[model samples]
Target: GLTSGHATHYYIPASDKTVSWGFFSKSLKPVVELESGDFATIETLTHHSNDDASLMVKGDPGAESVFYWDSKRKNVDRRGMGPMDHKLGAGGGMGVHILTGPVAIKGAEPGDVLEVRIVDVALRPSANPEFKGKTFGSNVAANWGFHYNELIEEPKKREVVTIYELDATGERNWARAFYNYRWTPQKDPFGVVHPIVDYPGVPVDHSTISKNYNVLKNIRVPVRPHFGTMGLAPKEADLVNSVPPSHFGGNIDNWRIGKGATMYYPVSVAGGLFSVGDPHASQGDSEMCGTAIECSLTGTFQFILHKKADLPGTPLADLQYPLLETQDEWVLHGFSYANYLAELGPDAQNSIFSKSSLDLALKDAFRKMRHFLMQTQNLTEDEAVSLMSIGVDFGITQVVDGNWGVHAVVKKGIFPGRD
Candidate 1:
């Protein structure tokens, strides 16, 4: 049943086939297997879990409803992945998000390259029966993101806003779109409203999750849906932390990975246990908020295998890191821990002192990009740096992930095709 170009529909709700917090394991079994050059459709869940329901219904539900995993919705098949009552502290990394599969690709092996072509990426319509639109959440957290030490509050726990819709009332381009933050807490709540980590039964505080976006009724934001986590099983036997981008590609939150983009990764294991999840409806470059519009997503991806010799920007039989190709640009990446005090070994996880920093990642990006340009564009250092000054564009791939990254983008039209 492995079709080459046609997409196979494979969707399991949040109730089934789900991953906890943010832990990925090479030992975990694949939900299914696919051949190289195969295509599949996947549905993922938002990190807030049942908090979205309590917020949507405004705490009207009972303890059984509030604490249960699935909403116990009618006619919905709940026989997939259950145990709704889940605990977080350890085993599964502290990072939050429900990732989907670790689907294996047939014949994929180390020393080969995997090309993931994103056919389409879009938000799940809605939880409403009528299905008018989707809802998502955004959070500005403390002690975990790029500005952990720069926070004014100790542990507000988290400040989240549920987004109902992205109103494109003003412009056509997403670069200039606006977002209306739905159900935000009162800026100045007195005594009882001051807030603590207690909801009807859940640990998240959803006091202001109302129907209206009254807080940000004046602005509309761009809705760009992309998978925040797309990775293959690392070759190492020990399971690794899944928060940072690595040679195997986890949490590379680059915003350019939309409908017309391509993700290139080196295969690190036989069968290439590929998993995709952590769908973000929209996010800024660095994810400075620690959370984007955390929402479920529907996407179609085509997988193709290649020999390293056939891959561009790689000299070894095995590709070193990840690369991206969009409609009109080729993007290169570099990753580093904040200070590079220690290298990420088998037992490594992305901690404050252990993960990548943006400064060194930027330097790595430049080095890789320079080599790419020198090889592909036939240019010298003088020519490359000078051209990069104006022609090439640089962007922060992400700052929140353990392996921080910077992207060096080269426009594809620079060769001057006859117009």
Candidate 2:
């Protein structure tokens, strides 16, 4: 669990307790370490936060929910220097939720690729013995989302609130596979901004936040169980927030990386300090509303090391940023630039992690597609672009993850007569 500094899994340094919550710089130490061919059934949390509350879970009797208690502990585990021997701390800067494991793999060095095969992701076991129910929460972030100012209410109050609910029992995959997983608001909305509510902390006056975000009231979402953030430590010697997506793959909020998928991230650090967190119950193309159906999830990931032949566009290419593969399709992830718009300038009018240029983001994806087409598909530049215009599909990957991203989706069957 890494709480007692215990090592239950391989590869993951148990990044959560290894590094304190809300902080991810290259300086932190790793907790547990392992080598290639080692597999761990790693558990993950949602981006549901409150002082430190940010994780979503699943169903109980057909109602989708945002749970308060985790399958591990009842609360956020906010105590220090006790016989409990726990290390749950508060985090406000490195993104809202608490992530787990930077499990280091032995013999893994920079430039070598680390491929993570997502074995499974499901609801955590019930924390309450008598409680056979599940929980989850959905939220709207404050300060710098795509079109942030345009979606505000009257009185100039910035209100980004989360909608909480419980899933009906047996609606397990139902909460995601089908929108049939219904919703019921557990608590009213909470503000996530300044001059109105506490900044970077839990929301206030649930009722007020509710009336403010009635526009998001009573909604049903298609669930896509996926990890929002996954990465290895950057090569930069200094510290960095966990908001941006890089070649090492932090905060890459693509929806296709769920169970049965393989995500390839370039290795940038020694031991390939791989970490995981920021789970989502369901999300849209761009994460348009800043948050998805934030829910807690449990899954198994298989880590494999691959030293391939060519660069990203060539046949059987090595990865550049991050590329995802499901059974039927190849998903290429690209970000124009991943910096906080607010940090960029006044001209950067965006939300917390959504600072990017669409034109540039698309261009980035275009290049990736062209590269892939030229090498793997045996298509020329003009043919690739034209094929992309028709056969290849492009869409906004996410705008809420610092690096605004777009993904190019090309069906493996694009080559005719293969059915």
Candidate 3:
């Protein structure tokens, strides 16, 4: 009935039943339950599937089911905590990610650390017969993009959606822009018309918009598949909006969280309800355009639970925010408000957007990096400060997420002889 010390492997496919649309909840039931040292292959769907349903959603059973919207009804209706009727002018834009799974790691508790090793990541192959060996993704340049406000074109403020196609197999190193179209008002099954891109998975009517085929001439984007959102449910709220990445990571839209990366998240609740989605084909450091190459991906992860009792004096012992470890460097994620959910109190959901600043995020990153250097490198505060100025590299992680982020990186190669 049981294998001793051997890790059990499981697969959680993205579907209406398995995925939590637009939000994460501590109260939500786990789709897959696992013990420490277990492995799970999780499938994720892009929230931007509606940008081009023909390529991303048409034939894919999971995508079609999750994004299904007819005249009478919808498959997955409740998008976020925002007002459905648009009564208070919230625009139903609170939490906007199609996250999959609250994979319960048995015996995981608060104060403990959950080690998530990204074993492998691969593109979800096209389900359409016509596009058999290809994979598709979308890049939405929305109203929230950094470049949205500063437009020199005739139509200054405009949102455009770009569809990209790539080879499913790893042989192709670049993705080509298939087509692009300006965002048009799309009415959902519930009769809610979205003027701007606010909600997730609202299928865009191709007939209503002019598709621009000639764009990004002779240019190909290098492929770097990664998950934009992956984190545990915070203990703060019953339904936590997935836009801001707090101590309990949600939407840390860093492309570095790819295959071969190890993310250590401090457990905040029982079972450490870990979910992942908002998969991206590729993205730059800042994620300046409000979105990445939003694509569906299947990732294999190995979970190693480190109990609180045994967490003292280790690098992970003091881990509060998500700490990433690659082969060569340790990347620390710092947000505008380190724990925005706690700092902003009851109105954190509404407050974070206004409070977020690059200064706060940079300071947070500097402080975390300082603590990390002192703790791991056995350096004094003065030594750490000096080392930080000279050696460590601080970078913008993402600005689109409500809680803007900055990351600090220090190469492990610098610390030779320490195992």
Candidate 4:
């Protein structure tokens, strides 16, 4: 029972029992439970620790425990909800984000809206003494990235990993590229070969590869620390891959979801079982390279639940997708397939990966924005579409996340006489 001001504060650290690797499910038990208006400090670990173990995994006991894979045994046995066969790295490597939580909010149920207000976000300082004032992260330009098939050079179909370092003191606003390595076959402890970057936490065998430190020189990347995946559990399947951004909001890799942002999610089950993962230090629109600066971070959030019966005439009354409010603007996330589970039948999870396209994402964004304008601003269909054309700004949220997203943002100042 931690207390601060008028709200109770709870701390949830990432551990084997507190975190889920690669998947989300309503069946998973909640690690923490709270009431509305409660504040929580949740810690998250990046799944890319294997890319640079020395800087990201070696000294952190939590990371070492989650990533342990020796010849004798593999800790955290069930990596995902996929097959339990060892040939596929034990859990099939179908999903790839290490999420922390499923934190349940008391009295939350279906049709209700859960408001998550991100208060602050900070880097998990390096535990290793050698890197005293620095924290690190990794980015993988995997086979799934938009740039993969467009490579014009030799060995066109290769995966690459880049390492980045940032100041831990909060003084530096930029991160510099430290090193990079090309993907090579590395056999997992379960005697399975990973020919590409397919699984999470598969330690890279640096002995067989050369590190290149001359890439992205003389350039500083502006840091925008945010969570790449965060949302409530879906009611469609007992086991859902964590790679797509659906109505439940998993893997919506928008950098705008950082400090001072408020995200609204429609609860689909009792307690609004919510989980978050895929922390990033920085990323641009589209996330063209499959990943951002995958870094471990700790975020403080305040949750407020809105009951369905009380939502009449409110912007969140019929919210089906995640809605974001930051400063003076409102953001609506749109995916290629708005409700893939209901639309694609039993094979929704697998089929979504193949059917997603930018065209479809764009259309969804337009439709959502139109609905927003009409419902919240009291505008007619004609007036909404016209306003959309003149004021709304739509941008590709991400392409690598299987569902593919486009987000529409409109300034709050556009509507007159509204606070």
Q: Among these predicted structures, which one has the highest lDDT?
A: 4
Q: Tens digit of lDDT per residue, candidate 1, span 165-255? A: 4322212323221223232332211112223221211323346553334555545567777888887767753454556667677777877
Q: Whole-model Cα lDDT per candidate?
A: 0.58, 0.57, 0.88, 0.89
Estimated TM-score for each candidate:
0.75, 0.73, 0.96, 0.97
Worst 10 residues of 3 by lDDT: 84-93
- For residues 107-133, what per-residue lDDT tens digits would candidate 3 score against the true structure? 998999999999999999988789988
Model 4 clash pairs are none
- Expressed as tens digits, the lDDT of each residue in 288-390 for candidate 2 is 7566666656667877776543344433364556878788888887777533332344433223334457787888888888877776677789999899998
Best to worst by TM-score, what's the order?
A: 4, 3, 1, 2
Between candidates 2 and 4, the TM-score winner: 4
- Lowest summed lDDT across 10 adjacent residues in model 4 is found at 85-94
Candidate with the larger TM-score of 1 and 3? 3
Candidate 3 or 2, higher lDDT: 3
For residue 363, model 4's alpha carbon misses the true position, in angstroms, by: 1.2
The positional error of residue 361 in candidate 2, measured at the CA in angstroms, is 0.3
Roughly what TM-score does model 2 have, to 2 decimal places?
0.73
Steric clash count of candidate 4 = 0
Show where candidate 1 strays beyond 4 Å. 1-15, 18-21, 54-92, 129-131, 151-158, 162-213, 312-318, 337-342, 350-355, 375-386, 416-419
